[PDB]
């Protein structure tokens, strides 16, 4: 009779046909991506497209529903996530141009091509050469050739569409009622009702200001490191007091450190811990492989695998005949239905990657019982982090040691400890700075802060005072040098890498209390402890339904993002770095010193 | 698509009772009047097995 009656009705209508249409477009798109072939191209467009129309009238009918007389906080949940217009608050002109405008980026981003002046014969790709050509090569002017030629022709095709982007962005959060797109960005974080646990849109970049100046530091030193070890690199074009090379960063964009390992290296003369050779040995399959990391994940105290996951999930090539997406990928079909697309080698790395997308589907399979628009992660990080913690569990010498992996004579010294940390920080904390940089930078002229034509110069300056990277050159406004990176592209979020680095070490100390392990973090494994299982599944059950305040605190007692847990797993590390250091000068200028 | 069940209903159902009604659900004030809609829902939804 009420209007919450009315809306728990249609919320079971909703949920019932959401589940089937879901499940019916899920399995489209699964077809697609494990079998490309025309007639899967034509149904996935044909699902997505009845998916997409589908959750257009079941807006179009909970916009009727007003929100200030409802006092049930999940009824609250369901009809604010379903109530979103997203690109449809505009008129249809402004709403083609807007998806004309996405899919030309799309085209754009995929089909780029960029190659030598004067031998067009054939030219080189972005994914099979440019990334190779950045993360292999040692020579400085054809490293920067590449750099310079690239943002030079995605940037001059780019600019003006990023122009007519950030102002349709910008009209489309107005009309849903949020200050700017990067308030709507960080409307996924937002918690409204809840008293103690109420999270606002604005507090956020505080929050993140609050745990990068305790970041800074740390990153500081390894950049100091990283600049010593590329002074070995580079003899003469790097400066000490100044910033490092653009272009000298081991990717195109520097988001990832992880491939100056072999540049960087703090004792080259140590073997790694990398144990593909013992899988090559002993014939370690896919299939066995995966049934370790079930192992793993029944010694926790998570539930196993079902049966429908063993049959219907291709964890194997299929053969040249038909082709598939190599991308590793968790899939949750609906309807009790869990599968991974995976192109399995037989490597460390994928070992690891098998437990992270392991994590994932477990974190899908613990939301099962919930209604179908809260089968999510409270927030955009949490997701990740759940799989990331279990790459950081099976990654330990105790973990490779206990399955057989790694020899039981193997010598655990604090050289190994040291590059295996570094290693780990040129992955993790390199990406720290420049995903706070980008998200800062989207979020000022999403905001109207940054003037129109003083883009480039505000970016290379924050990239200055922030990263600690300086350009080759200076670039004008007609170069496009952001929007070269994949997610800003393409319309993604950029702060739940950030979000998931800090909720992978919150976590991790979290099990590592709960399972109580006497000695130092990154030594921690979580296998064969059931307490930290369930103290994690608390928070895997719930999914959506609860603030991710409210998870937080369940799972590390606090309510706040914490950085606390990052800083106390690189310790020792931190520690090497003050002490190689001495000599080197921490910290950097803003000064155009060394180019 | 030939299992079915009933999804709303205005009562619980009495022990060993069967319903076989298809009259439109009218979960508020307006009158159904026969035709789906909002706020009016066809009872009998599908189970569909795969
Ligand atoms: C992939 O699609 C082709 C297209 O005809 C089909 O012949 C083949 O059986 C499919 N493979 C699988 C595993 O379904
Ligand atoms: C909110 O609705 C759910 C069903 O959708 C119900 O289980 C729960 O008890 C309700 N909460 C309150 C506080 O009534
Ligand atoms: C969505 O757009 C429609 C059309 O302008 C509007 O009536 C409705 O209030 C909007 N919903 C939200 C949540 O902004
Ligand atoms: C999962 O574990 C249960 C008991 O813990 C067992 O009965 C079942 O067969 C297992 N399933 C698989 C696929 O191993
Ligand atoms: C490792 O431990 C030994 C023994 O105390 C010490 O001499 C050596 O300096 C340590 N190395 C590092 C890199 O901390
Ligand atoms: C976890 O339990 C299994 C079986 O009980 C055992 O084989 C394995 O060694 C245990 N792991 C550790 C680290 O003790």
Redesign the pocket.
């Known amino acids: 009779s009420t209007i919450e009656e009315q809306a728990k009705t249609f919320l079971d209508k909703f949920n019932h046909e959401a589940e089937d249409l879901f499940y019916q477009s899920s399995l489209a798109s699964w077809n697609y991506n494990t079998n490309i072939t025309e007639e899967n191209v034509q149904n996935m467009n044909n699902a997505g497209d009845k998916w997409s129309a589908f959750l257009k009238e079941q807006s179009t009918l909970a916009q009727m529903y007003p929100l200030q007389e409802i006092q049930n906080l999940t009824v609250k949940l369901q009809l604010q996530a379903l109530q979103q217009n997203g690109s449809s608050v505009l008129s249809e002109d402004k709403s083609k141009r807007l998806n004309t405008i996405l899919n030309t980026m799309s085209t754009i981003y995929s089909t780029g091509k960029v190659c030598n002046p004067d031998n067009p014969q054939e030219c080189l790709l972005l994914e099979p050469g440019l990334n190779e050509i950045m993360a292999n090569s040692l020579d400085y002017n054809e490293r920067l050739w590449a750099w310079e030629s690239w943002r030079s022709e995605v940037g001059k095709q780019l600019r003006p569409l990023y122009e007519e982007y950030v102002v349709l962005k910008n009209e489309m959060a107005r009309a849903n009622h949020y200050e700017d797109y990067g308030d709507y960005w960080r409307g996924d974080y937002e918690v409204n009702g809840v008293d103690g646990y109420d999270y606002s849109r604005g507090q956020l970049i505080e929050d993140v200001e609050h745990t990068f100046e305790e970041i800074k530091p740390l990153y500081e030193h390894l950049h100091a490191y990283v600049r010593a070890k590329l002074m070995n690199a580079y003899p003469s074009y790097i400066s000490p007091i100044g910033c490092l090379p653009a272009h000298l960063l081991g990717d195109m964009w520097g988001r990832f450190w992880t491939n100056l390992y072999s540049l960087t290296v703090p004792f080259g003369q140590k073997p790694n811990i990398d144990v593909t050779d013992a899988m090559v040995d002993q014939a370690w399959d896919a299939q066995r492989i995966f049934k370790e990391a079930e192992k793993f994940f029944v010694s926790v105290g998570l539930p196993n695998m079902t049966q429908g996951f063993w049959e219907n999930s291709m964890l194997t090539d299929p053969g040249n005949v038909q082709k598939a997406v190599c991308h590793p990928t968790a899939w949750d079909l609906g309807k009790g239905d869990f599968r991974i697309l995976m192109c399995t080698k037989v490597t460390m790395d994928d070992f690891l990657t098998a437990h992270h997308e392991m994590g994932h589907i477990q974190y899908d399979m613990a939301y099962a019982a919930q209604p179908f628009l809260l089968r999510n992660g409270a927030n955009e990080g949490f997701h990740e982090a759940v799989g990331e913690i279990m790459s950081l569990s099976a990654a330990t010498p105790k973990h490779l040691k206990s399955i057989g992996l790694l020899s039981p004579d193997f010598q655990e010294?604090?050289?190994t400890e040291?590059n295996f940390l570094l290693k780990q920080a040129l992955t993790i904390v390199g990406t720290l700075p420049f995903t706070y940089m980008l998200e800062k930078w989207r979020w000022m002229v999403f905001k109207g802060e940054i003037p129109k034509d003083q883009w480039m110069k505000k970016w290379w300056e924050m990239k200055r005072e922030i990263v600690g990277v300086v350009e080759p050159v200076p670039h004008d406004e007609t170069y496009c040098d952001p929007a070269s990176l994949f997610h800003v592209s393409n319309d993604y979020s950029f702060i739940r890498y950030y979000t998931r680095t800090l909720y992978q070490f919150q976590f991790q100390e979290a099990l590592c209390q709960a399972a109580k392990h006497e000695g130092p973090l990154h030594k921690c494994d979580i296998s064969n402890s059931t307490e930290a299982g369930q103290k994690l599944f608390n928070m895997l059950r719930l999914g959506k339904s609860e603030p991710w305040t409210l998870a937080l605190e369940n799972v590390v007692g606090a309510k706040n993002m914490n950085v606390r847990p990052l800083l106390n797993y690189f310790e020792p590390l931190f520690t090497?770095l003050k002490d190689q250091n001495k000599n080197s000068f921490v910290g950097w200028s803003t000064d155009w010193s060394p180019y | 698509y030939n299992y079915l069940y009933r999804l709303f209903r205005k009562s619980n159902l009495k022990p060993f009772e069967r319903d076989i009604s298809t009259e439109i659900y009218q979960a508020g004030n307006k009158p159904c009047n026969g035709v789906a809609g909002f706020n009016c829902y066809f009872p009998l939804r599908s189970y569909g097995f795969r």
């Open positions: 010294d604090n050289e040291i090497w």
